[PDB]
Short mmCIF file of C-alpha atoms and ligand atoms in Angstrom, two decimals:
data_model
loop_
_atom_site.label_atom_id
_atom_site.label_comp_id
_atom_site.label_asym_id
_atom_site.label_seq_id
_atom_site.Cartn_x
_atom_site.Cartn_y
_atom_site.Cartn_z
CA UNK A 1 1.14 19.94 8.14
CA UNK A 2 3.21 16.78 7.42
CA UNK A 3 6.60 16.05 5.79
CA UNK A 4 5.46 14.43 2.51
CA UNK A 5 6.80 16.45 -0.45
CA UNK A 6 6.19 16.68 -4.21
CA UNK A 7 2.82 14.96 -4.23
CA UNK A 8 0.09 16.02 -6.63
CA UNK A 9 -3.13 16.59 -4.68
CA UNK A 10 -6.04 14.58 -6.24
CA UNK A 11 -8.80 15.09 -3.65
CA UNK A 12 -9.26 16.47 -0.15
CA UNK A 13 -7.40 13.46 1.27
CA UNK A 14 -5.58 11.62 -1.56
CA UNK A 15 -2.15 12.61 -2.88
CA UNK A 16 -0.02 10.89 -5.55
CA UNK A 17 3.65 10.82 -6.56
CA UNK A 18 5.92 8.80 -8.85
CA UNK A 19 7.98 7.15 -6.13
CA UNK A 20 9.58 3.88 -5.05
CA UNK A 21 7.80 3.23 -1.72
CA UNK A 22 11.00 1.88 -0.08
CA UNK A 23 12.98 5.00 -1.03
CA UNK A 24 10.09 7.24 0.04
CA UNK A 25 9.71 5.42 3.38
CA UNK A 26 13.46 5.70 4.04
CA UNK A 27 13.34 9.46 3.43
CA UNK A 28 10.07 10.27 5.28
CA UNK A 29 10.01 7.57 7.99
CA UNK A 30 6.19 7.78 8.03
CA UNK A 31 4.05 6.59 10.91
CA UNK A 32 2.49 3.93 8.63
CA UNK A 33 3.78 2.35 5.43
CA UNK A 34 1.38 -0.04 3.67
CA UNK A 35 2.65 -3.35 2.34
CA UNK A 36 0.95 -5.13 -0.56
CA UNK A 37 0.86 -8.41 1.34
CA UNK A 38 -0.51 -11.86 0.67
CA UNK A 39 -2.42 -13.89 3.25
CA UNK A 40 0.72 -15.85 4.23
CA UNK A 41 2.85 -12.71 4.64
CA UNK A 42 5.36 -14.28 2.25
CA UNK A 43 7.26 -11.19 1.05
CA UNK A 44 8.74 -12.21 -2.28
CA UNK A 45 8.18 -9.56 -4.94
CA UNK A 46 6.81 -6.13 -5.73
CA UNK A 47 6.21 -3.93 -2.73
CA UNK A 48 6.54 -6.79 -0.20
CA UNK A 49 9.81 -8.16 -1.55
CA UNK A 50 11.31 -4.67 -1.77
CA UNK A 51 10.27 -3.55 1.74
CA UNK A 52 11.41 -6.87 3.22
CA UNK A 53 14.74 -6.62 1.40
CA UNK A 54 15.19 -3.11 2.78
CA UNK A 55 14.65 -4.48 6.32
CA UNK A 56 17.39 -7.10 5.76
CA UNK A 57 14.66 -9.80 6.06
CA UNK A 58 13.57 -8.67 9.54
CA UNK A 59 10.06 -8.07 8.16
CA UNK A 60 9.88 -11.70 7.01
CA UNK A 61 11.15 -13.01 10.36
CA UNK A 62 8.53 -11.00 12.24
CA UNK A 63 5.85 -12.06 9.75
CA UNK A 64 6.64 -15.76 10.09
CA UNK A 65 6.19 -15.52 13.86
CA UNK A 66 2.89 -13.66 13.31
CA UNK A 67 1.56 -16.41 11.00
CA UNK A 68 2.75 -19.21 13.28
CA UNK A 69 0.71 -17.65 16.09
CA UNK A 70 -2.34 -16.32 14.23
CA UNK A 71 -2.65 -18.17 10.92
CA UNK A 72 -3.19 -16.49 7.56
CA UNK A 73 -4.88 -13.19 6.96
CA UNK A 74 -8.12 -12.89 4.99
CA UNK A 75 -8.16 -11.48 1.46
CA UNK A 76 -9.29 -7.91 2.11
CA UNK A 77 -7.81 -8.02 5.61
CA UNK A 78 -4.75 -6.57 7.30
CA UNK A 79 -2.48 -6.61 10.31
CA UNK A 80 -0.24 -4.00 11.91
CA UNK A 81 3.37 -5.05 12.45
CA UNK A 82 6.63 -3.18 12.93
CA UNK A 83 7.88 -0.74 10.31
CA UNK A 84 11.46 -1.74 11.17
CA UNK A 85 13.96 0.78 9.74
CA UNK A 86 11.40 2.20 7.26
CA UNK A 87 8.42 3.50 9.32
CA UNK A 88 6.96 3.28 12.78
CA UNK A 89 4.44 0.65 11.65
CA UNK A 90 3.78 -1.45 8.59
CA UNK A 91 0.13 -2.08 7.74
CA UNK A 92 0.15 -5.34 5.78
CA UNK A 93 -2.96 -5.26 3.57
CA UNK A 94 -4.12 -8.14 1.35
CA UNK A 95 -5.76 -7.03 -1.86
CA UNK A 96 -7.41 -9.69 -4.07
CA UNK A 97 -5.10 -11.37 -6.55
CA UNK A 98 -7.07 -11.10 -9.80
CA UNK A 99 -4.85 -13.67 -11.54
CA UNK A 100 -6.04 -16.36 -9.01
CA UNK A 101 -9.87 -15.86 -9.14
CA UNK A 102 -10.18 -13.72 -5.96
CA UNK A 103 -13.05 -11.16 -6.18
CA UNK A 104 -11.97 -7.65 -7.22
CA UNK A 105 -14.88 -6.41 -5.06
CA UNK A 106 -12.60 -7.30 -2.12
CA UNK A 107 -10.38 -4.38 -3.13
CA UNK A 108 -12.81 -2.01 -1.42
CA UNK A 109 -12.58 -4.05 1.79
CA UNK A 110 -8.79 -3.94 1.52
CA UNK A 111 -8.74 -0.14 1.26
CA UNK A 112 -11.16 0.19 4.21
CA UNK A 113 -8.26 -0.89 6.44
CA UNK A 114 -6.59 2.45 5.67
CA UNK A 115 -9.38 4.30 7.52
CA UNK A 116 -8.00 3.03 10.83
CA UNK A 117 -4.91 5.26 10.35
CA UNK A 118 -4.88 9.04 10.12
CA UNK A 119 -2.02 9.23 7.59
CA UNK A 120 -0.43 6.51 5.43
CA UNK A 121 2.13 5.99 2.68
CA UNK A 122 0.73 3.32 0.34
CA UNK A 123 1.05 1.71 -3.11
CA UNK A 124 -1.87 0.86 -5.43
CA UNK A 125 -3.35 -2.33 -3.98
CA UNK A 126 -4.23 -5.26 -6.26
CA UNK A 127 -2.30 -3.61 -9.17
CA UNK A 128 1.16 -4.55 -10.43
CA UNK A 129 1.86 -8.25 -9.86
CA UNK A 130 -1.57 -8.76 -8.19
CA UNK A 131 -3.11 -8.47 -11.68
CA UNK A 132 -5.73 -5.70 -11.41
CA UNK A 133 -6.02 -2.45 -13.37
CA UNK A 134 -4.18 0.40 -11.58
CA UNK A 135 -6.70 2.98 -12.84
CA UNK A 136 -9.45 1.03 -11.05
CA UNK A 137 -7.35 0.67 -7.90
CA UNK A 138 -6.87 4.44 -7.73
CA UNK A 139 -10.62 4.99 -8.16
CA UNK A 140 -11.47 2.53 -5.37
CA UNK A 141 -8.87 4.20 -3.15
CA UNK A 142 -10.34 7.66 -3.72
CA UNK A 143 -13.89 6.40 -3.18
CA UNK A 144 -13.07 4.36 -0.03
CA UNK A 145 -10.24 5.95 1.96
CA UNK A 146 -11.20 8.99 4.05
CA UNK A 147 -7.94 9.39 5.95
CA UNK A 148 -4.90 11.05 4.40
CA UNK A 149 -3.19 8.75 1.92
CA UNK A 150 0.05 9.44 0.05
CA UNK A 151 0.24 7.09 -2.94
CA UNK A 152 3.62 5.94 -4.29
CA UNK A 153 3.34 4.92 -7.98
CA UNK A 154 6.53 3.05 -8.98
CA UNK A 155 6.34 3.52 -12.77
CA UNK A 156 6.59 7.02 -14.30
CA UNK A 157 4.60 6.11 -17.42
CA UNK A 158 1.80 4.69 -15.26
CA UNK A 159 1.90 7.71 -12.94
CA UNK A 160 1.39 10.05 -15.88
CA UNK A 161 -1.53 7.93 -17.16
CA UNK A 162 -3.17 7.82 -13.72
CA UNK A 163 -3.02 11.61 -13.46
CA UNK A 164 -4.26 12.19 -17.02
CA UNK A 165 -7.24 9.84 -16.67
CA UNK A 166 -8.28 11.09 -13.20
CA UNK A 167 -11.12 13.60 -13.97
O1 LIG X 1 4.94 -2.68 -7.23
C1 LIG X 1 4.58 -1.57 -6.94
N1 LIG X 1 3.33 -1.03 -7.36
C2 LIG X 1 2.43 -1.74 -8.23
C3 LIG X 1 1.04 -1.03 -8.20
C4 LIG X 1 0.98 -0.18 -9.32
C5 LIG X 1 2.31 -0.32 -10.13
C6 LIG X 1 3.18 0.95 -9.98
O2 LIG X 1 3.11 1.63 -8.91
O3 LIG X 1 3.96 1.27 -10.91
C7 LIG X 1 3.00 -1.50 -9.58
C8 LIG X 1 5.41 -0.58 -6.17
N2 LIG X 1 4.88 0.61 -5.90
C9 LIG X 1 5.64 1.47 -5.28
N3 LIG X 1 6.88 1.33 -4.88
C10 LIG X 1 7.40 0.13 -5.17
S1 LIG X 1 9.01 -0.31 -4.77
C11 LIG X 1 8.80 -1.88 -5.49
C12 LIG X 1 7.51 -2.04 -6.02
C13 LIG X 1 6.74 -0.88 -5.83
#
């Protein structure tokens, strides 16, 4: 049993809710919250900007030190950093940015990072401002992630469409 509430079960291991991931993280304080990161860990908008803002910019400060030491992530890659006031850990995952010619096939590689964590709170990678179709992102998630994933869909209209088109 875990403390996530009001999710619609989609499969054995995937659950979905219309939720703002920052508000959900603040309420649940999960072990792992997933950030929709870019390779530079520059947290400006969407999930990354919102999480970073909720940490009072501490996420960005930590991230800048990480990049100065390690260099950029790979598209499809990830790193584990602090969850600050929101979660124990933040898994920063880079999905391909469709609007800049990066392969959508890398979305599967991005979701594979989730399998290193038993339970996660995550948004739909590559969707929203990253330019890919959220219906596709949900399908790749379901077909790739085997650990327990609690998906936070920001928009109610989109949430309802994702549920309706699922089977
Ligand atoms: O930006 C987000 N998701 C994108 C992926 C699918 C779209 C959606 O979920 O409506 C948009 C996101 N998701 C969840 N909590 C938050 S809080 C700020 C942004 C955000």
